[PDB]
RNA sequence: CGCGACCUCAGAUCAGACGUGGCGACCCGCUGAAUUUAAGCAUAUUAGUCAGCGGAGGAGAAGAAACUAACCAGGAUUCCCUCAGUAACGGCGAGUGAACAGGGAAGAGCCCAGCGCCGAAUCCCCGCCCCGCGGCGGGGCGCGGGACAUGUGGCGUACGGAAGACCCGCUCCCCGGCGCCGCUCGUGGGGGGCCCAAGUCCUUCUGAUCGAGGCCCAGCCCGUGGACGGUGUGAGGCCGGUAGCGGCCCCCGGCGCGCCGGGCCCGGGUCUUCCCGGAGUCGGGUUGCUUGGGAAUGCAGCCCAAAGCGGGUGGUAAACUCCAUCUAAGGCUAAAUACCGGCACGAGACCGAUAGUCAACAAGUACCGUAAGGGAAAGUUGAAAAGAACUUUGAAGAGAGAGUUCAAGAGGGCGUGAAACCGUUAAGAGGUAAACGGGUGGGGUCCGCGCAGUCCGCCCGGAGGAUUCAACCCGGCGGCGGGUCCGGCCGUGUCGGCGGCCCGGCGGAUCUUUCCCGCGCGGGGGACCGUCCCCCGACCGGCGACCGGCCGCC
RNA sequence: CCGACCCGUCUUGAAACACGGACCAAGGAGUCUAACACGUGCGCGAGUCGGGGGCUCGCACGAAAGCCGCCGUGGCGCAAUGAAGGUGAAGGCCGGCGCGCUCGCCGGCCGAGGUGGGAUCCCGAGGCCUCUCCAGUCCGCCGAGGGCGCACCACCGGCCC
RNA sequence: AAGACUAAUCGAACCAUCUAGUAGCUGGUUCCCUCCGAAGUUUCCCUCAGGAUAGCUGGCGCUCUCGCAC
RNA sequence: GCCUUGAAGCCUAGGGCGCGGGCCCGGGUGGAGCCGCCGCAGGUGCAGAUCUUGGUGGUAGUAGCAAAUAUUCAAACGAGAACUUUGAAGGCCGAAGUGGAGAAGGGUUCCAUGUGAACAGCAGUUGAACAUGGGUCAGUCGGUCCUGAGAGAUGGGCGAGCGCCGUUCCGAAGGGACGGGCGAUGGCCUCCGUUGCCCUCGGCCGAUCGAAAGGGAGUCGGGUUCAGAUCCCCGAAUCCGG
RNA sequence: ACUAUCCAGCGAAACCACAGCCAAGGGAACGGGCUUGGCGGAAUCAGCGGGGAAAGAAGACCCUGUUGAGCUUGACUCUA
RNA sequence: CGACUCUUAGCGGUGGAUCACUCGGCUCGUGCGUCGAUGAAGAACGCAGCUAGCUGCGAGAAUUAAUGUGAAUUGCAGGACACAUUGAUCAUCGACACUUCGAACGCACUUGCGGCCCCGGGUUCCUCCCGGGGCUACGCCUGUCUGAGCGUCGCU
């Protein structure tokens, strides 16, 4: 508040009295007569630097960057190693860019949902969520933030006919629409892996969104993908080629140490 | 999950409404379940409790299968008094012991006009619920 | 010398209506400062701001050009972006400081007077009959009163036009009363009320479980429901609730079709007249406040005081002339916008009892002051009072026993329960105040010896016992590698085939405007150019892009 | 046993006969916005930015996210100069018509000028070790010497107001 | 008539607000290790208990070169 | 991931680490939540500021409980007496009093019964304390009435405005009454008041406020309660109005 | 004569870095603490007033401040 | 051996820190956007079987009626409630009622003074006394009633 500490009518007793020259309260037959006011120190006073409401809370970020990153998160959604490292029990799915028939957009019952993931071997990540359901550590319990748990996989569809109301109730699962992707759901926490599940109709039309190398988007009006700075990263394969090895000196592995001077005389 | 924006989902507001509710609401909050037999016949799951209903106790020190009746419904503190559950005080005088009605099972009712009416509305609501969900 | 009138003027407990005061976050009108900055100060700035006086609404105010402009011109008011920290003001110093045009939200225009026509063709109140009555109306009959010619109503207001001739036109719109029917986008206008899925299953801790473990798959069951809260710890399935183009009942809405009453007979293309329209007002002097407004932007006082092809504006005073653009001195209006008070609601990367509202509790309370006024401290027994019966000492307060509870080492200001400061017990020491740093000694308290600590591991030699396999063969299975590139895929990179280019689309400041579509053009066609793709051949980079082969190895 | 004056602060100078300080727990003091300068990091690139508004979500998240003939109205930049009116950034070499006059007219070629220094790069006699002679092709490196010369610096010269 | 009294207050009462008035001047400013490491001097100021200017200090770099037979 | 087979926090002659900031183990208490890693953010680290709020020490069982002549003996209640009560003795106030009554102000402090925590700067069987109950009687005592110095509306004037000046001053300022006439009036319209007039005389001279000591008719004696009397009861009077 | 003094009963405050034996020396030039010498023995009672440069009041004397206010006038600028 | 002084640990005290909880605030946003002379805002006094405060209410006073629900309220009491006359307690809110001051309204602030019409005792109006009820404010608008003027004229 703007008025926290300026309800009073305090005034300093001057010098000549053995007190320490701050404002003090006017008169009375109370405790709070000549106590202390108007200051970060004094009990009942005001905070230092009242927190104002015209702080700068928000941020702008350039569009091309946000599109780049969206492209990056999808890439590492493949590359099993990164998914493993992000903690997703994944070692039984048959293929990592995981894709299914476009029939599942028409399911309506959670039993159809659950039965499916069992077959595709994605239920072990879900059990892992249930295990994680625990309680929070701090004052966030008073503030409507009382429980916490992991994040589970993510399903990406194009056309809705009731898929949402099937997967709505299962915990840790979030639904996305390919036309309106979000970084805050593909890279939760700031890191980059997440176990995502696709459909056919969604998966096919990615070429039309973010373009290939040769052509461009046709749904973004000007966006060609980012270009690589370093094509071949196979560093060991490079340095072990003959071409470079011919163009090298010899190494020198022998090692020389602190010799002890002895006296010739 | 919840979707409606005209109600609360907030710890403080629930508790305040609970500990300051009037009596015609405390009645519902002080509800209690049925046994398996009665459920089957009436096709119902819960009714609010009354003053001559026959009941068992399930949890606590005084659980067991001994059956008793209800004596007094002290809504102001969210408890009830059963006839045989009681303890001796220092002097040698018996006194009752309150218990929350969520922890008891009803075996016999105390029927009358209104209470039959009430059961019937519950039955038809569930009935169309099953037949339309199915 | 009585009556009509107004110059006019008072009275009444006359009949019937009205205004006053309060809140005051947002709004309108007046009045109106000093601290401070200038490193001093007097103009300036702070500031048309705090305080002060009035007046309102759910918004208010403004508002349909006496405009902007100088263009091939736009076209009421209000808010946003930008023009712009600019043009300009300024002890030209500190410092101040707009508008137009452009792009958006929203979008709606209209009445009087005065000229002029119509038998004042107009309004209010009492009386009686009939409908309707809880936002007092409608219809009818009174030689019933009154206002009005010192000017009421119809036509008509500069959009420039408006009235009185000549030919077409096809002739329903509203309200006063009385019924009807379909629930009316967040995917059901509003409000209120009652209801709707699934474990208290087996084994086991505990003071009591919402715990751990198990039930063909986090397992039994539900699931458009796994948000939250309560119950003797932590609850998808015990309870309330939650989701649902879920159900039942009640009232209030409006949107439209029927039936009488009454009104209104109410249009548009070629000639003669009308208006040229609103005075102590514009405008000009002199003064004072204000403004970015500068030989005076705006406002107000006092003096002087107009005209009618006139008047105003055209950002440097004045005269002479050409242009452009508006028509003052009368009036009304919704939407886009504002909101630290009020009535209801939701939410939070916020504070968590010396913090956050002064106020988490019988707080604007107790209390100080003659009054204006000032103004606090203060949260927690336990699951449940089961809140210590009875014995005994003492005048009682306080105590020793007993008893309740898992716990009173939880006993009515009782969660835990720090430090300073005290009481007691154990050890140790004591004439240069105490305390301190480095170096050793002595003593106690505890840790580990072990009541040996003899530490362990590889291979070779020896004496003892023991039971499978391996060594080598055969059978199946799996995997690594290979290149005489064995046969086939696939992938790229240009090429060869223009081969989809019309058998597929996208674009073009290239032409055909060889055409059309409605007529200098807006669009589809026709070429043309590029750009995405079809059939076979090649090789590099066959690369870490996959098979079936044959071979060796494990 | 030896050593050893109480901490903070002002000060040329404090153990001070210079101020503050009995003792304990809790609180307590370099912030937020607006504008500028430079340094670093990311993205696009002679262009680059939707921040205002609109199209899609009822908003559980999320008062988010995505998108736009708005796609650039506009702002910063690509061009300076003058009080203003206003003007507005390249040359040469050769041949034809007048007298190279520190000068005007017809046709081709190059072209942001040069001097000095200059990381790297290029050519390269003769080769460094070749169990012997000569022939001697691939590969380093030498190394005489000689050239193309980046940014940047100093100077000369030229063009615009 | 003493600059005396005006609610324990008078060479201009008291109450609230403007108001967190201004201060070239006093007092205070919260964990560690490593590294580099000062001035009290010039000119100008209604300047002499103070500021601007240069000097003294640090950090971030960049162009070159050498025991690299130069 | 840790956890009612025991979290946070707190204590510790215990074992140990790091140059240091700090940390990990072990034991006791206690009763429900807490931490490690990669990034984000901030109301982020105290010895002081004649710092703010609260609490506690030496001082210190100290300085003190000294203005106004003065106490003693016995008995009673009682657990209990230097201080209560009763009696007796000695002494002070000395009628401008340490006496008996009242105004201003206070507001149940008044009276009885009971209590002994707290308060009564020692004590207390007592109390103006604590608890529970009870108590103020008017035709004549005061107010109410009048006006005083003076305050203050109307009309009028002035003022941006809430409003201010001013009190007979720029006012058609009293509803005042009455004898007569006129028709009416209900009561047996006799006698009336009356709503109504025609007459009829009319000054005032300024609304209103303003004193419990000024002005203002009339009450005295006796008796009665734990506490009330010019008020209650007894008995004798008196003023005003009709 | 009332106290102070002793005993019973009740019971505060100001002040307080740590504390409390001296000479000389040097030092911010007049030290309880340092240095060289003198010396040093529990816990306490009534007094007195040499020291503690003893307590109180952010020195009113003096100076500075581009901090003020009361009063006067022939200071400057204004005004009823 | 003792006291006394100092240090460390264990236990007991004093005092209330830290830790964990929370029916409170602050901040943002959505919707609606309503006082009164038919007597407001605010003040005073009063009301419970046992009741001081806070809270609620107004002499019908910890609440009446009427709808919805459907067996309690509670610290003690006493009684009621028959829930198939129907209807305890709660909540809602459409009928009824709503003390004295206050813009505050008969004149004035002491609760003091009055005036008019009507009913009932005052008797049978007739006037004094008592009770009770309704009226008795300032400004202003339209209209009615009675009126004033050496104001302007007409008339006999
Ligand atoms: Mg505060
Ligand atoms: Mg915490
Ligand atoms: Mg008003
Ligand atoms: Mg100044
Ligand atoms: Mg200054
Ligand atoms: Mg000054
Ligand atoms: Mg100004
Ligand atoms: Mg104001
Ligand atoms: Mg308006
Ligand atoms: Mg600019
Ligand atoms: Mg200004
Ligand atoms: Mg514009
Ligand atoms: Mg629009
Ligand atoms: Mg729970
Ligand atoms: Mg739960
Ligand atoms: Mg349920
Ligand atoms: Mg003028
Ligand atoms: Mg100005
Ligand atoms: Mg107009
Ligand atoms: Mg208007
Ligand atoms: Mg507290
Ligand atoms: Mg606390
Ligand atoms: Mg507080
Ligand atoms: Mg315990
Ligand atoms: Mg406890
Ligand atoms: Mg405790
Ligand atoms: Mg001890
Ligand atoms: Mg110094
Ligand atoms: Mg000095
Ligand atoms: Mg020092
Ligand atoms: Mg000295
Ligand atoms: Mg000082
Ligand atoms: Mg001191
Ligand atoms: Mg602290
Ligand atoms: Mg930069
Ligand atoms: Mg003098
Ligand atoms: Mg400050
Ligand atoms: Mg100084
Ligand atoms: Mg100075
Ligand atoms: Mg607990
Ligand atoms: Mg914080
Ligand atoms: Mg801080
Ligand atoms: Mg501290
Ligand atoms: Mg410090
Ligand atoms: Mg003594
Ligand atoms: Mg005495
Ligand atoms: Mg007396
Ligand atoms: Mg006396
Ligand atoms: Mg008296
Ligand atoms: Mg005493
Ligand atoms: Mg007494
Ligand atoms: Mg009087
Ligand atoms: Mg008298
Ligand atoms: Mg003494
Ligand atoms: Mg000496
Ligand atoms: Mg000396
Ligand atoms: Mg000393
Ligand atoms: Mg002395
Ligand atoms: Mg001083
Ligand atoms: Mg001083
Ligand atoms: Mg100076
Ligand atoms: Mg003064
Ligand atoms: Mg002069
Ligand atoms: Mg506590």
Curated annotation (Swiss-Prot), chain B:
<dbReference type="InterPro" id="IPR005824">
    <property type="entry name" value="KOW"/>
</dbReference>
<feature type="region of interest" description="Disordered">
    <location>
        <begin position="1"/>
        <end position="21"/>
    </location>
</feature>
<keyword id="KW-0832">Ubl conjugation</keyword>
<dbReference type="InterPro" id="IPR008991">
    <property type="entry name" value="Translation_prot_SH3-like_sf"/>
</dbReference>
<dbReference type="GO" id="GO:0015934">
    <property type="term" value="C:large ribosomal subunit"/>
</dbReference>
<keyword id="KW-0597">Phosphoprotein</keyword>
<dbReference type="InterPro" id="IPR005756">
    <property type="entry name" value="Ribosomal_uL24_euk/arc"/>
</dbReference>
<keyword id="KW-0689">Ribosomal protein</keyword>
<dbReference type="InterPro" id="IPR014722">
    <property type="entry name" value="Rib_uL2_dom2"/>
</dbReference>
<comment type="similarity">
    <text>Belongs to the universal ribosomal protein uL24 family.</text>
</comment>
<dbReference type="InterPro" id="IPR041988">
    <property type="entry name" value="Ribosomal_uL24_KOW"/>
</dbReference>
<comment type="function">
    <text>Component of the large ribosomal subunit. The ribosome is a large ribonucleoprotein complex responsible for the synthesis of proteins in the cell.</text>
</comment>
<keyword id="KW-0687">Ribonucleoprotein</keyword>
<dbReference type="Pfam" id="PF00467">
    <property type="entry name" value="KOW"/>
</dbReference>
<keyword id="KW-0963">Cytoplasm</keyword>
<keyword id="KW-1017">Isopeptide bond</keyword>
<dbReference type="GO" id="GO:0003735">
    <property type="term" value="F:structural constituent of ribosome"/>
</dbReference>
<dbReference type="GO" id="GO:0003723">
    <property type="term" value="F:RNA binding"/>
</dbReference>
<dbReference type="Pfam" id="PF16906">
    <property type="entry name" value="Ribosomal_L26"/>
</dbReference>
<comment type="subunit">
    <text>Component of the large ribosomal subunit. Interacts with DHX33.</text>
</comment>
<protein>
    <recommendedName>
        <fullName>Large ribosomal subunit protein uL24</fullName>
    </recommendedName>
</protein>
<dbReference type="GO" id="GO:0005737">
    <property type="term" value="C:cytoplasm"/>
</dbReference>
<dbReference type="InterPro" id="IPR005825">
    <property type="entry name" value="Ribosomal_uL24_CS"/>
</dbReference>
<dbReference type="GO" id="GO:0006412">
    <property type="term" value="P:translation"/>
</dbReference>
């Amino acid at each position: 508040s703007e008025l926290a500490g300026h309800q009073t009518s305090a005034e300093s007793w001057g010098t000549g009295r053995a007190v320490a020259r701050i404002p003090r309260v006017r008169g009375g037959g109370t405790h709070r007569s000549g106590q202390g006011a108007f200051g970060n120190m004094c009990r009942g006073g005001r905070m230092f630097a009242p927190t104002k409401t015209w702080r700068r809370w928000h941020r702008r970020v350039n569009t091309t960057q946000k599109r780049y990153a969206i492209c990056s998160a999808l890439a590492a959604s493949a590359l099993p190693a990164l998914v493993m490292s992000k903690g997703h029990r994944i070692e039984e799915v048959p293929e990592l860019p995981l894709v299914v028939e476009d029939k599942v957009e028409g399911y309506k019952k959670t039993k159809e949902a659950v039965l499916l993931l069992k077959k595709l071997k994605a239920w072990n990540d879900i059990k892992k969520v249930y295990a994680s359901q625990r309680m929070r550590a701090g004052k966030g319990k008073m503030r409507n933030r009382r429980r916490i748990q992991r994040r589970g996989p993510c399903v990406i569809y194009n056309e809705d006919n009731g898929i949402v109301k099937a997967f709505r109730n299962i915990p840790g699962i979030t639904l996305l629409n390919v036309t309106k992707l979000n970084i805050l759901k593909l890279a939760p926490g700031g890191h980059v892996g997440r176990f995502c599940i696709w459909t056919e109709s969604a998966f096919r039309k990615l070429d039309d969104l973010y373009g290939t190398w040769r052509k461009a988007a046709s749904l973004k009006s000007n966006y060609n993908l980012p270009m690589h700075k370093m094509l071949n990263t196979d560093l060991s394969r490079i340095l072990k080629s003959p071409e470079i090895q011919r163009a090298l000196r010899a190494p020198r592995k022998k090692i020389h140490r602190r010799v002890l001077k002895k006296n010739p005389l | 999950m919840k979707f409606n924006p005209f109600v609360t989902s907030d710890r403080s507001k629930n508790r305040k409404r609970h500990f300051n509710a009037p009596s015609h609401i405390r009645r519902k909050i002080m509800s209690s379940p049925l046994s398996k037999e009665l459920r089957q016949k009436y096709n119902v799951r819960s009714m609010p409790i009354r003053k001559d209903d026959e009941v068992q106790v399930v949890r606590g020190h005084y659980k067991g299968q001994q059956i008793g009746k209800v004596v007094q419904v002290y809504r102001k503190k969210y408890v009830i008094y059963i006839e045989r559950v009681q303890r001796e005080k220092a002097n040698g005088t018996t006194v009752h012991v309150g218990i929350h009605p969520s922890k008891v099972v009803i075996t016999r009712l105390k029927l009358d006009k209104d209470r039959k009416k009430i059961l019937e509305r519950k039955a038809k609501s569930r009935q169309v619920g099953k037949e339309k969900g199915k």
